Design an enzyme around this catalytic site. Sequence first.
Site, PDB file in Angstrom:
ATOM      1  CD  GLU A   1      65.156  -8.975 -38.868  1.00 52.90           C
ATOM      2  OE1 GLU A   1      65.717  -8.386 -38.243  1.00 52.90           O
ATOM      3  OE2 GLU A   1      65.744  -9.868 -39.807  1.00 52.90           O
TER       4      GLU A   1
ATOM      5  NE  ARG B   1      69.569  -9.037 -36.033  1.00 53.42           N
ATOM      6  CZ  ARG B   1      69.823  -9.248 -37.470  1.00 53.42           C
ATOM      7  NH1 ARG B   1      69.099  -8.789 -38.241  1.00 53.42           N
ATOM      8  NH2 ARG B   1      70.893  -9.835 -37.857  1.00 53.42           N
TER       9      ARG B   1
HETATM   10  C1  2XZ Z   1      70.644  -9.302 -44.698  1.00 49.65           C
HETATM   11  C2  2XZ Z   1      69.824  -8.280 -45.638  1.00 49.65           C
HETATM   12  C3  2XZ Z   1      69.747  -7.104 -45.165  1.00 49.65           C
HETATM   13  C4  2XZ Z   1      71.010  -6.154 -45.457  1.00 49.65           C
HETATM   14  S1  2XZ Z   1      71.363  -6.118 -46.953  1.00 49.65           S
HETATM   15  C5  2XZ Z   1      72.549  -5.226 -46.671  1.00 49.65           C
HETATM   16  C6  2XZ Z   1      73.391  -4.542 -47.351  1.00 49.65           C
HETATM   17  C7  2XZ Z   1      73.420  -5.004 -48.650  1.00 49.65           C
HETATM   18  C8  2XZ Z   1      74.424  -4.218 -49.655  1.00 49.65           C
HETATM   19  C9  2XZ Z   1      75.216  -3.408 -49.365  1.00 49.65           C
HETATM   20  O1  2XZ Z   1      76.372  -3.106 -49.949  1.00 49.65           O
HETATM   21  C10 2XZ Z   1      76.780  -3.996 -51.304  1.00 49.65           C
HETATM   22  C11 2XZ Z   1      75.474  -3.043 -48.099  1.00 49.65           C
HETATM   23  O2  2XZ Z   1      76.462  -2.159 -47.836  1.00 49.65           O
HETATM   24  C12 2XZ Z   1      76.775  -1.446 -46.559  1.00 49.65           C
HETATM   25  C13 2XZ Z   1      78.352  -1.563 -46.708  1.00 49.65           C
HETATM   26  O3  2XZ Z   1      78.638  -0.777 -45.256  1.00 49.65           O
HETATM   27  C14 2XZ Z   1      74.411  -3.287 -47.059  1.00 49.65           C
HETATM   28  N1  2XZ Z   1      72.595  -4.860 -45.465  1.00 49.65           N
HETATM   29  C15 2XZ Z   1      71.679  -5.428 -44.752  1.00 49.65           C
HETATM   30  C16 2XZ Z   1      71.407  -5.499 -43.215  1.00 49.65           C
HETATM   31  S2  2XZ Z   1      70.774  -3.809 -42.934  1.00 49.65           S
HETATM   32  C17 2XZ Z   1      69.260  -4.237 -41.752  1.00 49.65           C
HETATM   33  N2  2XZ Z   1      68.601  -3.452 -41.076  1.00 49.65           N
HETATM   34  C18 2XZ Z   1      67.533  -4.050 -40.296  1.00 49.65           C
HETATM   35  N3  2XZ Z   1      67.061  -2.745 -39.598  1.00 49.65           N
HETATM   36  C19 2XZ Z   1      67.193  -5.338 -39.916  1.00 49.65           C
HETATM   37  C20 2XZ Z   1      67.871  -6.002 -40.719  1.00 49.65           C
HETATM   38  N4  2XZ Z   1      67.688  -7.219 -40.787  1.00 49.65           N
HETATM   39  N5  2XZ Z   1      69.200  -5.590 -41.600  1.00 49.65           N
END
Ligand code: 2XZ
Lengths: 230, 231
Positions: free
Chosen positions: B34, B99
């Site tokens: 991914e 994924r």
């Molecule tokens: C693990 C690195 C990817 C991240 S970073 C992140 C994130 C980071 C900081 C945030 O606030 C402090 C956050 O807040 C959401 C709060 O609801 C999400 N979510 C994610 C997951 S969203 C995602 N979408 C995809 N399509 C693929 C994937 N691997 N992850």
Amino acid sequence: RIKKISIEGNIAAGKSTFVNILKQLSEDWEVVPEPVARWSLTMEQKNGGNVLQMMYEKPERWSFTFQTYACLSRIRAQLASLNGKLKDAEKPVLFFERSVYSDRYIFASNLYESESMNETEWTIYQDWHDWMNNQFGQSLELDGIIYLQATPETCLHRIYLRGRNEEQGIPLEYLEKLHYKHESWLLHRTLKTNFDYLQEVPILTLDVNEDFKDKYESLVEKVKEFLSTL
Amino acid sequence: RIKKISIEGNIAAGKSTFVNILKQLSEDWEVVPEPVARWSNLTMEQKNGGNVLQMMYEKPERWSFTFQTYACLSRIRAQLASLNGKLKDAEKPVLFFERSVYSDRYIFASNLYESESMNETEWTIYQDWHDWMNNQFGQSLELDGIIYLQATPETCLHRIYLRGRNEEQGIPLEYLEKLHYKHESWLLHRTLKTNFDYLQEVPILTLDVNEDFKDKYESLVEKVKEFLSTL
Ligand SMILES: CCCc1sc(-c2ccc(OC)c(OCCO)c2)nc1CSc1nc(N)cc(N)n1
Ligand SMILES: CCCc1sc(-c2ccc(OC)c(OCCO)c2)nc1CSc1nc(N)cc(N)n1
Ligand SMILES: O=c1ccn([C@@H]2O[C@H](COP(=O)(O)OP(=O)(O)O)[C@@H](O)[C@H]2O)c(=O)[nH]1
Ligand SMILES: O=c1ccn([C@@H]2O[C@H](COP(=O)(O)OP(=O)(O)O)[C@@H](O)[C@H]2O)c(=O)[nH]1
């Protein structure tokens, strides 16, 4: 087999006018209007409407999203028009109200250059553009560009004439900027695009400073000669 | 003749570890890492992704939609690439995707929107774009099945400490918790609505991966080959 012709020009120059005219004049000529124009029932209108209003208020927040949805809608609309109509036509022409190349090398570019898109967005968009047009966009390839060249004051006045609430707030300065990127692409051919074939696409340029709604024969006579040299 | 099987799971549930174990058992077996995992440490994509990744961490409500569109485009491109590039000769080819585009939308893009990090217009534009494109491909990427690596958010939370990435060290437990429900709902209780027709009838292999399997994975693998022969 359908011939694909982009009408290109600044805001309120007269494209919707020119293209409305042309389409009436032959059963082998159809138009694909610009999504953005329709935005100012469907979820795209609804999506369109919100993002455009959003864009007016805070363009340094909404410009990447707006450019993404505008280009997509256009790709979609040109396909709908292409794979659908003109299959029984002797000399078929589709006239596009702007192109995915306007989307990028005029509007998006201007928004990068004016700092309403940051570098990551602009290169994210450029990557999205280079590749969305190669996966699904390859049948959209233009046989000709027609440039409707007209002054920034013409357009402000023409903006006023049309009386879209949101547009009246649009100032000469932006039109000048937008006016300025067209000339570099369409006249000098100063623009390196990532799509080489554009080097060879023949352009025609047409002076629409003079009102042309009662008097377009020289204008349409010029198009007619263009089409038969493509 | 290529079989396409998606490996799904929470942050640090064990997807990559497992997939790297699977790639080594079979010359016939290939994997598509991914892309946000690769940015989760370089090409032009890797430049943009590191940048957009850090911005998402810094302020999600501004960058979710930008992050989501780019993560999924980048996924779709690498997945189209394998199908065209990998495993050409093999007699029984199986491509393991880390994924999928459905997890992009129905786990992650959906959850950010629920957490109000994307508005209705950001969400409806995202979905529109996700369809148009994922209807354009007509069966090319469509899944033959799915393997769900199942962990508790708690296992997942530990695993991030082991993995050690500085920029991941604040993902709170409750964040891992909502994603758990989304996985649980989508792939175990199978209560999640999706717009993709065939996906209601996509076969599903659930493996509990809470126990360290790095040096003890044979039994998992038997369910995969077992599962794979039904396809
Ligand atoms: C693990 C690195 C990817 C991240 S970073 C992140 C994130 C980071 C900081 C945030 O606030 C402090 C956050 O807040 C959401 C709060 O609801 C999400 N979510 C994610 C997951 S969203 C995602 N979408 C995809 N399509 C693929 C994937 N691997 N992850
Ligand atoms: C015609 C209405 C679309 C709008 S609205 C808008 C706009 C509105 C207010 C602005 O300042 C507050 C603004 O400033 C840009 C800031 O750098 C742009 N620019 C635009 C031009 S961008 C564009 N991109 C396309 N791809 C297509 C298209 N028709 N227009
Ligand atoms: O030769 C012309 C061309 C256009 N218009 C008017 O200019 C306005 C903007 O034209 P158009 O809608 O074609 O603009 P565009 O599609 O270029 O944005 C409209 O109200 C037209 O009625 C005009 O008065 N004379
Ligand atoms: O059985 C296991 C599985 C994973 N891990 C570790 O936990 C972290 C999470 O694994 P991974 O990055 O593969 O999870 P993913 O996010 O890909 O699901 C890594 O440091 C692994 O080495 C482990 O110690 N034992």
